[PDB]
Symmetry: C2
Subunit: 191 residues, 2 copies
């Protein structure tokens, strides 16, 4: 029955931390926002960061979901266009100030470096290894060790997003970084 | 009163050097600051007049290790005898794979520093040290026609994300000598893809 409490808390936390950042909202305010007492919260979550970790899992589920929606909606013929769409998708979604706030800004501080690496690993890595293997098997990409490439691309993409997120002129930085990523990948991709 | 100040400058350096050695070998976590004070020729009070806490001393250790990583980078690149900006860039990536492979660097910079400094703190370190060098190389490649005119800082920023991830993928690998080789070819392909020469 406590499964329900969990979800009301996660939902409330996501909304409030979404709008005002981890720092600006405390857990009592979230408990009110959910239909829950503080004791019901502390039966279910050890501390602020544990609740935040579950908020990230749910935000990631949906960032993954959006990614696959935007990529499918782009009408990509081949693995090369699939990859090309995937990068555009990631630039839009990471630009959404909920994602920007929770994932790009708060999560690195609240989770470690260690903790944060693992989140991108869980969610992106397989999807990225997937796309690459398809590009290789379709002749659009040289046969190469798949995980190192993937691992490196993830470093490039996450840094792109955070460069933007923190930029002096964010709408400009998005556009330029978009072309930069496109050139980087269009360099390796056959067609 | 000169000689307490001079002795204090001297203490600072023995502490930085001692911390670097000990944390170099066994990691931030496994060595405590009292052990470092012994290792130097210093008392606890001499340490705490010069460093507020463990992490402050660690930050100074990072600065000195970075100075040398930067220094080595420029030494390896110059020593490679690269004709053009393209070869310069090519050498720079090989150099970074060797230097980051140095177990001191691996330990202090690739593993400990991200945990001890924040995300925020750690970003700033790569920014300070690499960014200019990377923007430099790129601008030369562009000005020499070996690279399309592009916004320079975004590209640089992105390449740094790629390189730092390369090094850490290796640093943490089940088979590190293999992971270095594969990641080397990966980076080479990525840059040979963009570079005209």
């Amino acid at each position: 029955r406590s499964a329900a409490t969990r979800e009301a808390l996660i939902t409330g936390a996501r909304k409030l931390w979404g709008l005002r950042g981890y720092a600006e909202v405390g857990t009592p305010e979230i408990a009110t926002e959910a239909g829950v007492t503080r004791g019901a919260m502390y039966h279910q979550f050890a501390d602020k960061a544990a609740l935040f970790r579950d908020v990230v899992e749910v935000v990631e589920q949906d960032v993954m979901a959006r990614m696959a929606t935007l990529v499918a909606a782009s009408g990509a013929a081949t693995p090369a266009d699939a990859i090309r769409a995937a990068v555009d998708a990631w630039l839009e979604v990471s630009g959404d100030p909920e994602v920007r706030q929770l994932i790009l800004l708060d999560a690195p501080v609240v989770l470690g470096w260690a903790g944060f690496r693992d989140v991108a690993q869980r969610y992106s890595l397989g999807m990225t290894e997937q796309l690459i293997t398809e590009a290789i098997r379709a002749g659009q990409l040289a046969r190469q060790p798949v995980r190192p490439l993937a691992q490196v691309l993830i470093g490039a993409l996450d840094e792109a997003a955070m460069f933007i997120a923190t930029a002096d002129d964010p709408k400009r930085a998005r556009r330029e970084t978009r072309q930069v990523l496109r050139r980087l990948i269009d360099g390796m991709l056959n067609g």
